[PDB]
């Protein structure tokens, strides 16, 4: 009932962010506005009939 999950360190896909939206990120992270880092991990089970 214990599985060793080992994600790779290198990114799965090249970072698909538009230069304009990346500039939006930059200017949002340059004010008093507080944003949160997102850490999402999803465990998906095999289908059970």
């Amino acid at each position: 009932d214990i599985l060793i999950v080992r994600f790779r360190p290198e990114s799965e896909i090249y970072w698909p962010i538009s230069q304009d939206s990346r500039n939006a990120m930059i200017d949002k992270l340059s004010r008093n506005t507080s944003v949160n880092f997102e850490v999402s991990l999803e465990f998906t089970r095999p289908y059970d009939p």
Binding site: D1, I2, L3, V5, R6, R8, P9, S11, I17, L41
Partner: protein, 49 residues
């Protein structure tokens, strides 16, 4: 690497407190690049009502 179109992110995890504590499970380095894996130990339940 090459031009800004190829943004890639690499993640390295550091254990809180003491990284060398025996409680942690050792992360084997990548066999292809030479970086530690990101380990997430899973405690899976099997019973459902």
């Amino acid at each position: 690497g090459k031009s800004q179109n190829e943004k890639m992110w690499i993640a390295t995890s550091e254990h809180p407190g003491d990284q060398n504590a025996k409680l942690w499970i050792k992360t084997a380095n990548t066999t292809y690049s030479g970086r530690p894996y990101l380990q997430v130990v899973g405690f899976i339940d099997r019973a459902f009502p």
